[PDB]
């Protein structure tokens, strides 16, 4: 169990750690989060009390280094930093724990939610979508645009998700125009899975990462990417049976975890109605279809 200490909390802020969140008051004696489960990526995220705009945060994996948070009064945000001196870090953490100035990562033993949301998400893949190679952790916020959004403007601050476009030469073999447009299996299986992602685990990892950025930061280009990756699978007549079963589990836990009051903006009516009721895979997502119908029957 690892720890992310905070130097201080000079501004009033709602702090998120994965699917949990805590309010901290201005200059409250808060010095970090302890008992963070090892084995998963995590995200620590922020919304200032005075500007409910720009949610922002950091993806990290405590196995990769000792990380802490420190407010910067010049740039006006809580920043993640790595502490390279191992004995200084242990000493800071032990003092803050002794003074009981840390919140505990509040995981219920029965609860597999975070594992289910991050099953295929790896830090090394996050760091290729979010390029800042001098850090082991990755910053994301509400406003960052995707490579595909930019094509349609600062490249260093982009989300380099894999570009998917159903009306593209990449998606459509010359001479198979109708076949490939109406059945996307060659684009899914040959172009994307065999060619670009190499395996379905990397595909699901990017899909799960896109969902989490949409949910935690309201990042619109991430929501576009999540839906596109769902649609590419559902619009393929030929998908490996293990992928469809895993997809149904992935989406089930995403829909279960989504705030009930954000379904209006984070869920695309066309994609979901097409995927659950018209597509090739309309009968292959039983768990997702059941939770969608009982939780969001309006959308459909």
């Amino acid at each position: 169990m690892n720890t992310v200490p905070f130097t201080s909390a000079p501004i009033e802020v709602t702090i998120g750690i994965d699917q949990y969140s805590f309010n901290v008051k201005e200059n409250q004696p808060f010095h970090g989060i302890k008992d963070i489960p090892i084995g998963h990526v995590h995200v620590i995220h922020f919304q200032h009390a005075d500007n409910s705009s720009m949610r922002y945060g950091y993806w990290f994996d405590c196995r990769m280094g000792n990380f802490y948070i420190q407010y910067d009064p010049k740039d006006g945000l809580y920043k993640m930093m790595e502490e390279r001196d191992g004995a200084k870090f242990e000493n800071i953490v032990h003092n803050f724990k002794e003074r009981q100035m840390m919140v505990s990562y509040p995981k219920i033993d029965e609860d597999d939610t975070w594992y289910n949301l991050t099953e295929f998400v790896q830090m090394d893949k996050i760091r290729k979508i979010v390029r800042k190679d001098e850090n082991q952790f990755s910053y994301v916020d509400s406003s960052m645009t995707t490579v595909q959004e930019n094509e349609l403007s600062d490249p260093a601050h982009s989300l380099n998700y894999t570009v998917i476009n159903f009306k593209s030469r990449e998606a459509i073999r010359p001479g198979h125009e109708m076949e490939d447009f109406l059945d996307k299996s060659y684009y899914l299986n040959t172009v994307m899975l065999q060619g670009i992602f190499k395996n379905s685990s990397n595909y699901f990892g990017e899909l799960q990462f896109a969902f989490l950025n949409a949910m935690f930061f309201g990042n619109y280009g991430s929501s576009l990417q999540w839906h596109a990756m769902i649609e590419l699978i559902c619009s393929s007549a030929t998908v490996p049976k293990h992928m469809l079963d895993k997809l149904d589990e992935i989406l089930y836990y995403q829909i279960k975890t989504l705030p009930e009051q954000y379904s209006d903006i984070l869920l695309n009516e066309r994609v979901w109605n097409i995927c659950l009721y018209s597509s090739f895979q309309k009968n292959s997502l039983h768990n997702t279809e059941k939770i969608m119908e009982n939780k969001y029957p309006e959308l459909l």
Binding site: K167, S168, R169, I172, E177, M178, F181
Partner: protein, 237 residues
């Protein structure tokens, strides 16, 4: 974006463009089977691809053998249309290729867009106009070449005959759409108007009769009468 009444003169400017109408590509007669079920029999069809500035018509005849052993023919017909339009564009010299293709039915947008991916600079547009090109098969010489075809064939026409020697392409298009609208609303009466006077003939190399300017005014007036009457009937007003 979409072509409508507000940007109508754009049709007659100097950027090459083509209208594509697919309404006569897949044609069937519906009939009863010996067992009392219903079946269809396809007949020859055509793609209607028209330059509204020059009158040049690229009539691709769709022979019924295209449909043999295929499923979902109404859907295939859109993609076959798109395949043939794309093949036509590739066949044209660069300086003859269109800068825009306007489809008369919105369901043709995605099929044509996908087939034209190789031509990212050719715009594929819908229209808000209700153009009467489905009535192309009411032009006797066009219907005759479609029905007689024994194989896929492209036949080239000028749908304006020699009108552009005397009138502009805006006026020629207006005459064409009036003639076709009339033929579409009451084919029998429209055809009666166009031939009633046996002294006005159709040249071997033309589609329509050789009317003088004054006779075209009479003709055009008879077509507008036909259309309005029909309309009061259709709607009882």
């Amino acid at each position: 974006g979409a072509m409508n009444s507000s940007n109508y003169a754009e049709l007659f400017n100097n950027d090459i463009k083509l209208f594509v109408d697919d309404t006569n590509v897949y044609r069937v007669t519906v009939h009863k089977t010996f067992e009392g079920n219903v079946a269809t029999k396809a007949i020859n069809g055509c793609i209607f691809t028209l330059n509204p500035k020059t009158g040049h018509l690229f009539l691709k005849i769709i022979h019924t053998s295209v449909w043999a052993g295929q499923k979902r023919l109404s859907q295939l017909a859109k993609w076959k249309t798109a395949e043939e339009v794309s093949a036509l564009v590739r066949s044209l010299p660069k300086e003859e290729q269109p800068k825009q293709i306007i489809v008369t039915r919105k369901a043709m947008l995605d099929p044509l867009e996908v087939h034209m991916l190789d031509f990212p600079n050719i715009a594929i547009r819908p229209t808000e106009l209700r153009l009467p090109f489905s009535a192309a098969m009411s032009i006797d010489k066009l219907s005759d070449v479609v029905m007689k075809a024994t194989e896929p064939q492209m036949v080239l026409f000028n749908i304006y005959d020699d009108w552009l020697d005397r009138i502009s392409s805006y006026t020629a298009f207006s005459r064409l759409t009036l003639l076709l609208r009339a033929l579409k609303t009451n084919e029998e009466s429209a055809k009666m108007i166009l031939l009633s006077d046996p002294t006005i003939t159709i040249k071997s190399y033309h589609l329509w009769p050789s009317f003088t300017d004054e006779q075209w005014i009479t003709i055009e007036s008879q077509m507008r009468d036909l259309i309005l009457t029909e309309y009061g009937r259709k709607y009882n007003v």
